[PDB]
Amino acid sequence: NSNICEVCNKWGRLFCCDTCPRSFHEHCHIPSVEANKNPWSCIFCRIKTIQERCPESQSGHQESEVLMRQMLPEEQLKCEFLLLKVYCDSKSCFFASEPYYNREGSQGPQKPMWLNKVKTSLNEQMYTRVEGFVQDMRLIFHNHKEFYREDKFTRLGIQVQDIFEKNFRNIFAIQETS
Ligand SMILES: [Zn+2]
Ligand SMILES: [Zn+2]
Ligand SMILES: [Zn+2]
């Protein structure tokens, strides 16, 4: 197994996947690394199994159909994995914890949102459809763009949203378009 966490790229107290060489901090993995379970298989491995069991699940989909899906176990897992892919980018640090807003010439968002809030909401099964999870994730970046206006820091929102959107299209097999 790797000697660093797959998500944050640091050493520490690492749990090792039994079916692949990745390793994780306990609360870096999503869901948090399960207490017992020998063998244990990481989220990467569990996602690859879904695909292998249903090869047709990789054919293109429309985003509007994906969003309306109910959050059954496989869609819950897909959203957990998509969240974890965002945390995998170091620039996620800016969007992880609860923000606050006191900048001359700007007003804070009406509905603040952040990654750890989405993480809690997934863990507590608060989303009934994929749409709920995707709306809260997109709201993180939209809030940031609106608040930071012409400051160059707005670009961090564009960057991390691009990581989100690319991974969304991959994990949910969204039909490729020009
Ligand atoms: Zn970690
Ligand atoms: Zn694995
Ligand atoms: Zn099948």
Side-chain angles (χ1 to χ4, degrees), residues 27-36 38-42:
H27 297 311
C28 281
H29 198 269
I30 308 179
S32 290
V33 170
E34 297 73 5
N36 210 288
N38 318 57
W40 178 77
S41 265
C42 77

Side-chain angles (χ1 to χ4, degrees), residues 32 35 57 67 77 102 111 117 131 147 150 163 169 177:
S32 290
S57 73
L67 300 182
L77 193 71
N102 196 1
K111 187 175 165 183
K117 184 176 170 76
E131 184 177 44
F147 182 70
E150 313 301 279
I163 297 295
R169 290 186 307 267
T177 53

Side-chain angles (χ1 to χ4, degrees), residues 6 16 25 43 50 56 60-61 64 76 90 96 100 106 119 125 132 145 151 153 177:
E6 187 77 357
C16 287
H25 300 107
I43 193 156
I50 302 323
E56 69 270 32
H61 300 78
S64 62
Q76 174 80 32
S90 66
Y100 62 86
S106 287
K119 184 180 275 200
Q125 299 160 302
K145 287 165 79 181
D151 195 290
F153 190 61
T177 53

